[PDB]
Design a binder for these strands. Structure first.
Length: 68
DNA sequence: TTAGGGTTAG
């Protein structure tokens, strides 16, 4: 069954595959990086004010999460 | 792989 243990973002260590929640404190719209994939940058914050950065890579915009 | 948020001088 579907499950998610939302936990303060600081606990999300490298190599871990996680299910999370947060407000977007800052983000860049999808832009083409040196690589082949457009990179969208997102800074997210949870209810405990803890932060996480996300780099969302895709060859196009539509494949990425929808944020405005 | 890249990038991995913060002012151009147009």
């Amino acid at each position: 069954a579907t499950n998610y243990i939302y936990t303060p973002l600081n606990q999300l260590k490298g190599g871990t595959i996680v299910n999370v929640y947060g407000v977007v404190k800052f983000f860049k719209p999808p832009y083409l990086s040196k690589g082949t994939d457009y990179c969208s940058v997102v800074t997210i914050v949870d209810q405990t004010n803890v932060k996480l950065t996300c780099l969302l890579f895709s060859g196009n915009y539509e494949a990425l999460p929808i944020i405005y």
